[PDB]
Amino acid sequence: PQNGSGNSTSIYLEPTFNVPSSELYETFLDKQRILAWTRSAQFFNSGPKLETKEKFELFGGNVISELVSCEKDKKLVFHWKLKDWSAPFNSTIEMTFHESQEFHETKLQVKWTGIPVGEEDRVRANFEEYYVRSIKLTFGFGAVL
């Protein structure tokens, strides 16, 4: 048969952060604050905040992301793709904010689609460490234990 790649899959994560949606939304856009919880960033635009259809490399250039669509403190859509992945593979992260004023927290519903079947646990095991725990430790958005 012909040589090719495999199909894709999708995962769902729901981390809870002790921070309002006004500050958590700026965490994923402020380049000076993105470099804090990532320790490695490569922005190609001189703008201070991320814009639509703006590409940027993270973690020594291995993580390529691009902001496609975003609403004011409510929606965040990124075109996440790993450098180890092949050319046709490309994923899309859909972040939805579920801030609850009763407990003073925000549960960021993340609907991640487009990841390969062989990497659905790789990008998930690193998300709770490079995206969830890294923000909760650098900015202190909740106790880590």
Partner 1 sequence: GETFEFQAEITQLMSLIINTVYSNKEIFLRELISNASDALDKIRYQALSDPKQLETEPDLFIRITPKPEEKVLEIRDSGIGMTKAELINNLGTIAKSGTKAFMEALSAGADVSMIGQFGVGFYSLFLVADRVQVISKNNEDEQYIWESNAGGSFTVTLDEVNERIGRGTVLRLFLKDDQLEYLEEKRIKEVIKRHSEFVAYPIQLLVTVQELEELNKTKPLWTRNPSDITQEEYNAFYKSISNDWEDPLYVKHFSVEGQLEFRAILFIPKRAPFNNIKLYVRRVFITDEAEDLIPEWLSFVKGVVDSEDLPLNLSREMLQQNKIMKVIRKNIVKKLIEAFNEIAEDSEQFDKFYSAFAKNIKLGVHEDTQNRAALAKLLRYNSTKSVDELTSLTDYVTRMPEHQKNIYYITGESLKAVEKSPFLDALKAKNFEVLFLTDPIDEYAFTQLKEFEGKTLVDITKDFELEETDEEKAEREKEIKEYEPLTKALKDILGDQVEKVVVSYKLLDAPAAIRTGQFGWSANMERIMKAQALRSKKTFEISPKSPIIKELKKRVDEGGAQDKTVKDLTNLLFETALLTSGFSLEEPTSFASRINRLISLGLNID
Q: Which of residues 54-93 bind partner 1 (CB under 8 A)?
A: 59-60, 62-63, 82, 84
Find all residues with CB under 8 Å of 43, minimum gap 6, and list them: 31, 56
User: Which residues partner with 82 through β-bridges?
Assistant: 63
Is the CB of residue 141 less than 8 Å from the CB of residue 119?
no
Is the CB of residue 122 less than 8 Å from the CB of residue 9?
no
Is the CB of residue 106 less than 8 Å from the CB of residue 99?
yes
Question: To the nearest whole angstrom, how small is the minimum distance from the Cβ of residue 46 to partner 1?
Answer: 26
Answer for which of 10, 12, 14, 40 binds partner 1 (CB under 8 A) is 40
Question: To the nearest whole angstrom, how small is the minimum distance from the Cβ of residue 70 to partner 1?
Answer: 22
Q: Does 27 bind partner 1 (CB under 8 A)?
A: no
* Residues binding partner 1 (CB under 8 A): 1-7, 9, 18-20, 23, 39-40, 59-60, 62-63, 82, 84, 102-105, 117-118, 120-122, 125-126, 129-130, 137, 139-145
